[PDB]
Ligand binder design. Structure first.
Ligand SMILES: [Zn+2]
Length: 68
RNA sequence: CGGGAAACCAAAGUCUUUGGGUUCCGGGGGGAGUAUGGUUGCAAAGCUGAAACUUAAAGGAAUUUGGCGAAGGGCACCACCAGGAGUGGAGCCUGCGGCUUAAUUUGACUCAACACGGGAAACCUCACCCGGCCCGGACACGGACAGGAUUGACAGAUUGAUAGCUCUUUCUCGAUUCCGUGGGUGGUGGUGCAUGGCCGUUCUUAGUUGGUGGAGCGAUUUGUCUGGUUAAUUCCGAUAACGA
RNA sequence: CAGCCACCCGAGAUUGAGCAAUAACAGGUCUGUGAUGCCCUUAGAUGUCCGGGGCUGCACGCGCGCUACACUGACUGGCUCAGCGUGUGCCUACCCUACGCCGGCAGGCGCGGGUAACCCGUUGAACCCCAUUCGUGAUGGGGAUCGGGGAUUGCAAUUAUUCCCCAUGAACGAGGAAUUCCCAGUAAGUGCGGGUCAUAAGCUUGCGUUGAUUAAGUCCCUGCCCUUUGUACACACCGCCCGU
């Protein structure tokens, strides 16, 4: 029920639509162009990408941060 | 002998196998030996004496535990005598009550609670408190679908932590899930005055019970006792009791 | 008669302990359990989990225990005698120690033994015995309180976990009313094992050494059991029942 102390809500992940639009760029030619840097770790595959931050990228379940 | 409901009775006997003669007197218990009327008396008060109403009991005899401010016995170093060590007085450890505390968690209060719960706890113990995350809400019904129902986290504000528990920021797991209702699980939450089991105490004292038979209409009683002995209802013995 | 006492012979002419009848307590345990009825909670938890704290906090009152008040003694050396036991784990990592060095000390590294009458271990235990110092003085009694330093256990010792070394040296002069336990290897003075245990016993249960004074009785006190008697009680005296 409603207690005296406030409670922060859980991390409700907002649904993002048409994410498959935002992975590759499509031109008149059939050659694709990836928009994200690829993770070279052997735990994940070659189809996964990295996170899109504003300073540096971030891998998936590998949780490895690579600088420049 | 006989009789009675039995205590008991040579009369309370000679009584359904009722009948010797003759006076007074009682028909559940209260109201009530009261009111009125008469009568007797100096007075107090004696004699005769109802009804209305109310109740399903009031009473008599007698056996077993019960309870005595009744009597008589027996046993016990958790009772005493004669003694030994002592405790209670001093300091320390432990437990309980009280005060105090955000909390100082709780049960047990004469034997039969207080170094007890196998309780000598720094953290787990923990059942108590200040605080924050994980779900360990199974399974069904109805909303959302592989285009995503969510878990897993990094320069920086942040408790407490590099628990991403949040907020800047999105690849990662793919139908294993999120949401409302039934329902389910977990609970050192409450009730031992609902219990089961276990244990303690009366009691570790020496006390219980049938079979046959005797007595009484019967409940019931003797056996299980006046006495002697023993740690002992342990034996002996007097004895309608023998055998267990 | 049941049996009792003393004596001779003979190891013992009463060694100790386990279970312990019918019936009953509103005795204790829902905090031993996945034994459990009902009730409460269940996502923002009364479950679970983590960090830290508190069960230990003190004007005070009570019960089990330990050390003492000393010369029947304290201190310092030497002599010499035991028995129950225990000892390397499913989860699991905490086993018992001989032997040679370092250090006054607790403790530190290697060489080993034992899955056990094999190794610790002939468990060289304490009390006791012998010889000096001390001399009735709150004193070499008593060791509370406390300061500094050094080690082990563990992630963490502060509200000293514990141990060791040096200082500190209070109360206490055999204790009021009251009260506990005990008849022979008994009480008592002493030590050693087991449980608790990561470090650990002023507690409990066992083992062993030295080892007595008094009693072979009673119902006075404290309780229990039984017989006789009385009952207007049978919810049983916490009973029944009279009157304004
Ligand atoms: Zn990767």
């Amino acid at each position: 029920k409603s207690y005296t102390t406030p409670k922060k809500n859980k991390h409700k992940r907002k649904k993002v639509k048409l994410a498959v639009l935002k992975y590759y760029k499509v031109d008149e030619n059939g050659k694709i162009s990836r928009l994200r840097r690829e993770c070279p770790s052997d735990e994940c595959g070659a189809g996964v990408f990295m996170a899109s931050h504003f300073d540096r990228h971030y891998c998936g379940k590998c949780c490895l941060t690579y600088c420049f």
